[PDB]
Design a protein around this ligand. Structure first.
Ligand SMILES: [Mg+2]
Ligand SMILES: [Mg+2]
Ligand SMILES: [Mg+2]
Ligand SMILES: [Mg+2]
Ligand SMILES: [Mg+2]
Ligand SMILES: [Mg+2]
Ligand SMILES: [Mg+2]
Ligand SMILES: [Mg+2]
Ligand SMILES: [Mg+2]
Ligand SMILES: [Mg+2]
Ligand SMILES: [Mg+2]
Ligand SMILES: [Mg+2]
Ligand SMILES: [Mg+2]
Ligand SMILES: [Mg+2]
Ligand SMILES: [Mg+2]
Ligand SMILES: [Mg+2]
Ligand SMILES: [Mg+2]
Ligand SMILES: [Mg+2]
Ligand code: NA
Lengths: 271, 77, 100, 149
RNA sequence: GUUUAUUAAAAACACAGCACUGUGCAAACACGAAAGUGGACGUAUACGGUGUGACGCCUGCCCGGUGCCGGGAGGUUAAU
């Protein structure tokens, strides 16, 4: 799965590819596609609000079923498909009634496996249940934060959530960041980890590989002039300043979370 | 905009005076809050963006009295 | 065919549903062309130490002759059943019918 | 805020007092519900002078037929359908919704919000001691059973 | 590869890689008086910021100063 490229040229010497032979070679399921136009990090006002965004390959958007609300009807996986939008791979599933959908592909999922959602579903991976029927200690992913919201936690490749406790109406989750968080037990989760766990093992190898992922170069603040960045100035590699964002806020350790609305759900912050 | 529907209170302008009496322009904003008011006559709730003083006015008078004045002014609710 | 000895302890609040559990599992083994040799039901026994802050666990013993796949799905049933505490499956290399 | 009451309030009401409540209590709870109206002199005579007895009789003849539950036990200990697996373990829980409609003739007779569940929504096969608040002091104690069909 | 259009193409910038740090999602952050938008129809194997800069072998001591993080007993301390 992880292949080192031979150094036939610089820019190829350090490339490490993540090759999955089970990904569908061919076109994605057209009914579940739609346009996803690039923004270049610009917003309503046409101004850069997120730096280092722009370019990269054109990408169609795959409508992935995060809700997983086709309860009781079994589905069979037919393809593992590459998704340019997420780090995870997606699986095309066919329900018994003839409906096809895209779901996040869990680790042990391949073509032909059976999945279903609902309260009566089994505890095999790829099945979606409320975290009230899922046993405590189970490894889940695609976790809803509100009942019916859709599933926002543990969606990246190789990620998962551990159900740590169930105090009746709520369930405590250990997130991939190490944070303990309360979630309503009626929220839904898919059993197993997210597949494509070797995604983090890839090495881009060259500047161009990041460029065609839509990532524009980052200029260090200390390389700028004082008018551009709080870092910057000096007759050759001077810093003499506490590291800050381009807008003067201290970076290198300073809590920026200020919600007061969701702290009731956070059992313990990450460490 | 930030206007009380009952009293007509809107942002007024003033100065920030420092200890050195430096004057910088500032706005005084009304204490506005959207609030669903129960209209006993019409068997329904009417949401109004009112200042806190506007709420006190609605308690002093009736809600119907204030709605009549709002209707007279052309203020839609 | 392999001989297994299954001892599983049940929460002493679902004990009145234990007979429902018993015939569900025996049907699974018999349905899969197995055969139950012993089906002793020891009832509500004191534990030697608290398990899940409990005592009085309901012990059920059964010696069966089933194929592997039935046993694993039986163990899976025990694992995901919260009314079952501390199941225990062992090979016995012989059918056992004598009482305990 | 001075307010004149229209019915029995738990901790400050005697159906005719002019207690001094906080503005939020009157504005958001007491007035929008039929419990009190502001104590303007307009209302005070327009309360005391002519209805100091007719709303008293209306409340009393309304407390009657509400204190008349007639649903302390509707038919028997009512048995309600549900979908569940083994070991009890109600898959689809029973809530204030399902209790109300099933206990009555398809929910027409009784409303949905007067169902009190001390144990919360029902999550296991069995009979549970659910309450029923038809009126401000009415506690109907129907036993509801749930069966996995 | 990029750069001072019009005296500087470089050892400068970027870079893949590395590390720290923030961020549990109505994310942080940014643009906006706000609505809203980008981040992202993404979800910690993600995203932002900062420094360093393939790779190899490595990265030692100091928390006194400044900053940041945590604690709150005590002292001081605003409006009221
Ligand atoms: Mg960036
Ligand atoms: Mg970088
Ligand atoms: Mg840089
Ligand atoms: Mg310079
Ligand atoms: Mg500056
Ligand atoms: Mg500098
Ligand atoms: Mg410099
Ligand atoms: Mg120097
Ligand atoms: Mg250029
Ligand atoms: Mg040029
Ligand atoms: Mg030049
Ligand atoms: Mg020049
Ligand atoms: Mg030149
Ligand atoms: Mg420079
Ligand atoms: Mg340069
Ligand atoms: Mg450098
Ligand atoms: Mg120190
Ligand atoms: Mg401190
Ligand atoms: Na220090």
């Amino acid at each position: 799965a992880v292949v080192k490229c031979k150094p036939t040229s610089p820019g190829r010497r350090h490339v490490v590819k993540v090759v999955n032979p089970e990904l569908h070679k061919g076109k994605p399921f057209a009914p579940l596609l739609e346009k996803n136009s690039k923004s270049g990090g610009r917003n309503n006002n046409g101004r850069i609000t997120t730096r280092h965004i722009g370019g990269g390959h054109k990408q169609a958007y795959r409508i992935v079923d995060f809700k997983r609300n086709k309860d009781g009807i079994p589905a069979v996986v037919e393809r593992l498909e590459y998704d340019p939008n997420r780090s995870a791979n997606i699986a095309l599933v066919l329900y018994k009634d003839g409906e096809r959908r895209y779901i996040l592909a869990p680790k042990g999922l391949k073509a032909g496996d059976q999945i279903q959602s609902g309260v009566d579903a089994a505890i095999k991976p790829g099945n979606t249940l409320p975290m009230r029927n899922i046993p405590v200690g189970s490894t889940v992913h695609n976790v809803e934060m509100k009942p019916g919201k859709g599933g926002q936690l543990a969606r990246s490749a190789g990620t998962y959530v551990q159900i740590v406790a169930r105090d009746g109406a709520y369930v405590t989750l250990r997130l991939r960041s190490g944070e303990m968080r309360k979630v309503e037990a009626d929220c839904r989760a898919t059993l197993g980890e997210v597949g494509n766990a070797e995604h983090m093992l890839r090495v881009l190898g060259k500047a161009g590989a990041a460029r065609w992922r839509g990532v524009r170069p980052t200029v260090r603040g200390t390389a700028m002039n004082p008018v551009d960045h709080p870092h910057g100035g000096g007759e050759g590699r001077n810093f003499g300043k506490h590291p800050v964002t381009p807008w003067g806020v201290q970076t290198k350790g300073k809590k920026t979370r200020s919600n007061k609305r969701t702290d009731k759900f956070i059992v313990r912050r990450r460490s | 905009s930030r206007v009380c529907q009952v009293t007509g209170k809107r942002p007024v302008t003033g100065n920030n005076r420092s200890h050195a009496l430096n004057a910088t322009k500032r706005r005084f904003l009304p204490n506005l809050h959207s609030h669903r008011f129960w209209v006993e006559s019409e068997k329904r709730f009417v949401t109004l963006r009112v200042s806190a003083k506007g709420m006190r006015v609605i308690d002093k008078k009736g809600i119907d009295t204030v709605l009549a004045e709002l209707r007279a002014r052309g203020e839609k609710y | 065919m392999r001989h297994y000895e299954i001892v599983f302890m049940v929460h002493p609040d679902q004990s009145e549903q234990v007979p429902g559990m018993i015939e569900r599992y025996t049907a699974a083994i018999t349905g899969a062309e197995g055969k139950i040799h012993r089906l002793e039901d020891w009832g509500r026994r004191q534990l030697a130490y608290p398990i899940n802050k409990l005592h009085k666990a309901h012990y059920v013993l059964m010696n069966v002759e089933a194929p592997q796949e039935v046993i694993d799905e039986l163990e899976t049933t025990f694992r995901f059943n919260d009314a079952v505490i501390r199941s225990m499956v062992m090979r016995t290399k012989h059918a056992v019918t004598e009482a305990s | 805020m001075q307010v004149i009451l229209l019915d029995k309030v738990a901790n400050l009401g005697s159906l005719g007092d002019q207690v001094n409540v906080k503005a939020g209590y009157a504005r958001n709870f007491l007035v929008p519900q039929g419990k009190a109206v502001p104590a303007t002199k307009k209302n005070i005579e327009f309360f005391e002078a002519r209805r100091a007895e007719l709303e008293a009789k209306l409340a009393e003849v309304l407390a009657a037929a509400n204190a008349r539950a007639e649903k302390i036990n509707a038919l028997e200990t009512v048995t309600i359908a549900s979908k569940a697996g083994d070991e009890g373990k109600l898959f689809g829980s029973i809530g204030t919704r399902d209790i109300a409609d099933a206990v009555t003739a398809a929910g027409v007779e009784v409303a949905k919000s007067e169902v009190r569940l001390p144990n919360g929504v029902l999550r296991t096969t069995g009979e549970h001691e659910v309450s029923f608040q038809v009126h401000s002091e009415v506690f109907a104690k129907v036993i509801v059973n749930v069966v996995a069909e």
